[PDB]
Amino acid sequence: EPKDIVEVPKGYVYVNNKELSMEFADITDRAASTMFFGELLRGFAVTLAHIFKEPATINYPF
Amino acid sequence: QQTLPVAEVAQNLPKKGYSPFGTKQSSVAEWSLARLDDLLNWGRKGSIWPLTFGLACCAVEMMHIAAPRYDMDRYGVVFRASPRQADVIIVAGTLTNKMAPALRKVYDQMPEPRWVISMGSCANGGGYYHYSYSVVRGCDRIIPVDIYVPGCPPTAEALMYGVLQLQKKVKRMKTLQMWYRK
Amino acid sequence: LGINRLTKLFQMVREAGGLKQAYLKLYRNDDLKIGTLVGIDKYGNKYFENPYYFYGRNRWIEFAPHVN
Amino acid sequence: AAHGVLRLVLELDGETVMRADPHIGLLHRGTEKLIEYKTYTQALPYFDRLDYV
Amino acid sequence: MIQLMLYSLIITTSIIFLNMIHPLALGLTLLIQTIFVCLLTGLMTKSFWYSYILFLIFLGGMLVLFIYVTSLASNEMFNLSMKLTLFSSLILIFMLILSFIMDKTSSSLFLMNNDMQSIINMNSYFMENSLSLNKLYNFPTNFITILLMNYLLITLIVIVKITKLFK
Amino acid sequence: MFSIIFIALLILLITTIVMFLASILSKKALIDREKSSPFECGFDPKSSSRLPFSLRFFLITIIFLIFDVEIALILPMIIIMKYSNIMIWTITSIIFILILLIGLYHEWNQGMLNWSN
Amino acid sequence: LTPFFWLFEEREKMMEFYERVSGARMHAAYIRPGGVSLDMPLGLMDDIYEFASKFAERLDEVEDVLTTNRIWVQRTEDIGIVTAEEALNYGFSGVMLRGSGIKWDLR
Amino acid sequence: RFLRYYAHIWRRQFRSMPLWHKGEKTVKQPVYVSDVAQAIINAAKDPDSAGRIYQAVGPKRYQLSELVDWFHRLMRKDQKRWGYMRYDMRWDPTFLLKAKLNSFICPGTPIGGLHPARIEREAVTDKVLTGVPTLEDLGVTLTTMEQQVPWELRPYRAALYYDAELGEFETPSPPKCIEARDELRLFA
Amino acid sequence: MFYMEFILSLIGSLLLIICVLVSVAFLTLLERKVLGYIQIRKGPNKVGLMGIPQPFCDAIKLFTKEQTYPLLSNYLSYYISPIFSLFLSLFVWMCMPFFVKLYSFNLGGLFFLCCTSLGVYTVMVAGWSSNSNYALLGGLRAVAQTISYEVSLALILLSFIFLIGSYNMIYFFFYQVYMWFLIILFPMALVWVSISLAETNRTPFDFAEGESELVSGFNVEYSSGGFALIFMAEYASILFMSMLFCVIFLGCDVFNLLFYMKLTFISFVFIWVRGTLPRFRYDKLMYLAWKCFLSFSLNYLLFFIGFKILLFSLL
Amino acid sequence: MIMILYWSLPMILFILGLFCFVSNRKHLLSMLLSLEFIVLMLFFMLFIYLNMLNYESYFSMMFLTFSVCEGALGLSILVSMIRTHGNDYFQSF
Ligand code: SF4
């Protein structure tokens, strides 16, 4: 995990303190994600998958 | 008040036919015009497109019907945003004075045959705000209502039951068959 | 492919009464399922339950035939 | 996306929105006055209507 | 016949062009004219290559400016007159029957389409645009294309100099 | 071609006939003053509503034309490549694209699309 | 569309719970001055447990789908920056305030 | 029937409304619909009106040429190009065929009410008589055309050419009534 | 003989026209069903037997519905655009490739560019005829989207054109005779999906008709019969691009059922996007059009031009 | 006569274009559109000549590239002109 950017006490959770690394493996990862839309592929496959869940429509009025 | 027939009475009775007109037509013109009405009603019945006016509180049920539990496009119902392409208007929520001219304008910009469902008590008779200085007591005073869905809000089942009731009204409408008499 | 699923289709389709008695049921109810006769209504209706499905589908009704 | 209620009177140049006047009050149902006329127990559902989500 | 009918349609639309004064009506008129002229030049050409080209540049892209900036609309829509249409139909028809009458050949161009070249011509059996567009790229007549592209570059430098009057 | 021409004429005629037919199939209604107003979400349309023509969309379409013409210049490269002399075809085409990139990248540093307005 | 529909599936389960306690889908009257109007039906505790059990899966499905997505990220990110001081003097609160950086919350 | 008829397209020839005797040998006195309705109710509330005819007419008689010209002025049909002309219906034998065909073809109401019976109606003059009571006897104020018609026909205004000027064209100068002796001049 | 030639050419054109129209009208159901299952809905299964006649039902509604024509005199001009759009979306088919000669249509790629271009005039004049600022904004946004993407669309084509060595589409089959062509030009496929999706105005590039930003864009002021024609025109368009994707990347095997299997899968893929992606902004899309795609296409142009020079060197 | 049967149609159209270019129009847009029609006719004369010529045909692009630039410049100055005065109407001239 990357370090934070603002030190947090308890009773809270900062949802953006995580740093965007500049390590070469980290930049090339993000670059490859943009060049081949990995994140879109993850979401794409999700919806394909979720065809294979049975719809929850009640056959009203029967 | 009437009541359903009993088991043996059903046994005697035949199929209730499909076209609500029946199949007793006398002459060729009558029988032909009966079928064309049936086809027209079938088209207007199967595909009906609400406008999604949905002002308030009632609107949430108007969305739950679109939700996947009591699926409504299952019945052939779709929410077209543009009133020129919307065939039905589910007025839902309160009609304040600022809104009254707006509802009127939206209604008649929609082309006919246009049917209105007054969902919820707020639209039916002004609902819980009936004695208010700013609310149209009911929506019957702005537009011709066709179907009333009581509830506050109506449970989603109630709403789409009313939709089916509108489908039945769309099914039995007599336009060609009775133009012949006109 | 048909992993003991076409078999189930054969059960519902055949014991319905043939091609005609599977199509008319399907044509009317827009779905064909298998259950047990929970109880026969006083007015010709017939109630069917099957825990195989879920709560939406758990219980259902075949209305009286004379209602076309 | 306008909640069915909101009415923004917008003045645009090109496609950007310069002046954006929102006209809240297309729903106002005189609920403060009605709450006054009724009883505390009777007045309770009014609040559930408000912020109906 | 197609060729002289196409003259007739261009003549009729031209008469339409000189009458119409609403900018959309004029711009509409240009649109039809362009299809017609593309058709006509195609017929007398070796092929329709240039016709497809000038279609997508002249009409496809560049008349978009004219219609768009001429979206002034006059503030109101057309008052279409069925009379100029009927005259347009009327003038078209007896021009069309005359086209049926006119001399079949002599009323046609003399240019040499790929078909109207002689069979012996060994050059004609190549790809239809190969030998025509050869020297647009082969020296020493290709630098002019370089002048074209830089001209277009400079054209953009000009547009941002005229279209950037304080806003 | 004229085989194409006739088919298009036939389709267009069939198309207009269909829409002509639907124009008679659809029932008529007595006209209404308000049924024929512009749609403005149900609140009266303002003055003429003719949009301002002080904007950039012509500017973008002008960029279109420049690149649209440039596209025309490079279309024939497909066929002539088998015939033309290779040096000239090679260098000549390469500098086309190279000048395009440099125009583009120089223009990003200009950043002309990020207008102040 | 897909996020809205997937979540509005689960919204139905929660409303059913309101229906179980109060007798109305929405617009219960269940909370009253002397405490809640009425006791809870037996077993509603358990049904709540399974619903909470599955909700992590449902929320994560949409979360993984939509949080990272570039279109969504660029479509929302850096929209309408709300500085801290400007937030207070305009009388903000809630996750708006809590998002701008203020560590305030009524709970 | 009245204004839609004089507005609808089939009624028009190319740009030349055909009128019987150029519409210059006809006297019309139309009345506004609501004032007719308001009369109906007022005479329904009163039973002492029972057994009494009532000639319902407007305030000021008019000549059909005056009306149509005013109509086209209201509709902006006369600025430069739309080019209104008035024929004689007798001169042109095409208008009748339009009516006959339009009747024979339409299953419902013929388009624009073009059936011949409407044509005879416009031709017929409006003969009032004294003694027969009137709207004033019914206590009904009569909004004039000058108050009602402009707004009435506002939807059908058109022809705002790009070639010409608009807006600054004056308000349509009203028509002018026809008096009793002036009628006697008309009929000679 | 010769007139045998012409008669068949007209039969094929006519036969294709009825099929493509009935297909897209019938395809609309597949959108409604498929999207219904992406979302956890059940989709239309009510009318007929499992909602099969749903799209015929829709057409009957529309044609019965009156034609709420806009302001008095616009009758024609408002009645023109739907014709002039459905015409393009159909007639664009005639250039599609066959081994069984429908035409000897050369310059097919050029003709593709031309028809895909002409969509701008239809949408723009349609909005102009409507005369409603809502409709007018839609047209302008619609115009900008289409016009911007054509620039990238052209250069993208040229990469394939060079790789096949002619403008005749049919050569895509000969060059794919061994191994498909997607596996060579994978990034181009993603870009080409986006370009095709932009042309047909589907989402994520849904600005032209759209919803929730413009009521229906240009479509907002359209009554029934006009609306049905526009709606059919769009779906004829979405199919054709699906075909073009199939003939370029995925085999061009016109005389093999697997080609038609591929047609459905790609048209499905379009929907698969419809129910997944959110929409873009105006400006972000223009960055994506000029600052991203144009650069992309030029590099491959400069990449493949050298490759074919090397290829020509070898032989 | 060769010109009367072949180069005549281009003449008649070209002259009609010029007359419309010197007619009366509320703004200059009708003028620009008028000369634009002339360009198409100008192309027409040019192509029939370039068609006399076996390969000199390609000169179409040179003329087309130049011609569209004139139109772009034409729209350029007009649109800047509305923006200057709030109008480019001939009454301003
Ligand atoms: S009727 Fe009930 S649910 Fe509907 S808006 Fe009124 S309070 Fe809300």
Author numbering:
A (entry chain I): 32 to 93
B (entry chain B): 40 to 221
C (entry chain q): 5 to 72
D (entry chain D): 95 to 147
E (entry chain J): 1 to 167
F (entry chain A): 1 to 117
G (entry chain D): 202 to 308
H (entry chain P): 229 to 416
Paper lines:
Respiratory complex I powers ATP synthesis by oxidative phosphorylation, exploiting the energy from NADH oxidation by ubiquinone to drive protons across an energy-transducing membrane. Here, we isolate complex I from Drosophila and determine its structure, revealing a 43-subunit assembly with high structural homology to its 45-subunit mammalian counterpart, including a hitherto unknown homologue to subunit NDUFA3. Cryo-EM particle classification identified three distinct states in our preparation of Drosophila complex I, which we refer to as Dm1, Dm2, and Dm3.
On a global scale, the Dm2 state is ‘twisted’ relative to the Dm1 state: with the two models aligned on subunit ND1 in the ‘heel’ of the complex, the hydrophilic and membrane domains twist in opposite directions (there is no apparent opening or closing motion between the domains). Inspection of the set of local features in the core subunits that differentiate the mammalian active and deactive states in the two minor states revealed that both the Dm2 and Dm3 states also most closely correspond to the mammalian active state. Figure 6a shows that, in the Dm2 state, two features of the mammalian deactive state are present: a π-bulge has formed in ND6-TMH3 and ND1-TMH4-Tyr149 has ‘flipped’ its conformation. However, all the other key elements remain in their active states, including ND1-TMH4, which remains in its bent conformation, and as a result the ubiquinone-binding site remains enclosed and sealed from the matrix. Notably, the trigonal junction between ND3-Cys41, NDUFS2-His93, and ND1-Tyr134 is preserved in all three states, occluding the Cys from the matrix and explaining why a mammalian-type deactive state of Drosophila complex I could not be trapped in biochemical assays. The twisting motion displaces the N-terminus of subunit NDUFS2 (adjacent to ND6-TMH5) and changes the NDUFA5/NDUFA10 interface, displacing and disordering the N-terminus of subunit NDUFS4 and causing a small decrease in the interface area. In the Dm1 state, the phosphatidylcholine headgroup stabilises the ND6-TMH3–4 loop at the top of ND6-TMH4, whereas its absence in Dm2 allows the TMH3–4 loop and TMH4 to move, along with a further adjustment to the adjacent C-terminal loop of NDUFA9 and displacement of ND3-TMH2–3. Comparison of the Dm1 (active) and Dm2 (twisted) structures of Drosophila complex I determined here suggests that the Dm2 state is a relaxed state, which may be considered a structurally curtailed form of the full mammalian-type deactive transition.
